[PDB]
Every structure is written in structure tokens, then in C-alpha cells.
Amino acid sequence: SMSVKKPKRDDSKDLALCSMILTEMETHEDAWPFLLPVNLKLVPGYKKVIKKPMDFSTIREKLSSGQYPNLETFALDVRLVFDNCETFNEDDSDIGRAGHNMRKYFEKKWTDTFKV
Numbered sequence: 001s002m003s004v005k006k007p008k009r010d011d012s013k014d015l016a017l018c019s020m021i022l023t024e025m026e027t028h029e030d031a032w033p034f035l036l037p038v039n040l041k042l043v044p045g046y047k048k049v050i051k052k053p054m055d056f057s058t059i060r061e062k063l064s065s066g067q068y069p070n071l072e073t074f075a076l077d078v079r080l081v082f083d084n085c086e087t088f089n090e091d092d093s094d095i096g097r098a099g100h101n102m103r104k105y106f107e108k109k110w111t112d113t114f115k116v
């Protein structure tokens, strides 16, 4: 509250660390469904069904240009990529499996980097 601050974590490295995480995700073999926005002319349903599209390149642009106020807003966008993927794709598709794999990969890096 006013004039009563919790000590707070050094956040000076967050930009660099999120960039490194994102780079590791971009170079993962299963990142191919996620590298560019879903093309709304190529994919029947996508536009109407997925209210807030997101993808690695859009995250990279936002990161590179100071559009994430903090760590958590970055993790929300990453999770949005995988949540959209689950909403739109069957678990038993190549894309559905990629999303599950990439989410698991991300959350471990996230916990390893920031919780520990």
C-alpha cells in the first residue's frame, strides 16, 4: 500500500531472458506451426473462431519493440499461442501434438528461469 513496498525481484534481466526463451522456442523442431500468424485466407474457421490470434513472430516483434510491460504479459502471449492451438486443433493431429510439446517445453524453461 501507499509507502509500504514489498521487496521486489531484480527484473533487469527479464527482457534478455524472455528473448532467450523465445529463441529456444523458435528453434525447436516442433515450432513450425507457430512461427508465423495463421493465414486467415488459408484456414477455414480461424478468423471467426480464434478471437485473439498469436504466434512466435508476433511475440518477437512485440518483445523487440517494448510492448510487454513485464514478464507475465509475455508469458500470457506465449500461453495464448498454445491455448488457441488447442481450441482449433485435435490433440491427435501433428499440429495439436506440437502445441502440447511446445507448451511443456516452454513451462519448464519458464519455471527454471524465473521461479528458480
Ligand SMILES: Cc1cn(CCn2cnc(-c3cnn(C)c3)c2-c2ccc(C#N)cc2)nn1
Residues within 6 Å of the ligand: 032, 033, 034, 035, 036, 037, 038, 039, 040, 042, 043, 085, 088, 089, 095
Ligand atoms: C502460415 C499458414 C499456413 N497455413 C496452412 C497450414 N495450417 C493449417 N492450420 C494451421 C494452424 C492452425 N493452428 N496452428 C498453430 C497452425 C496451419 C499453419 C499455420 C501457421 C504455420 C506457420 N508458421 C504453419 C501451419 N495457414 N497459415
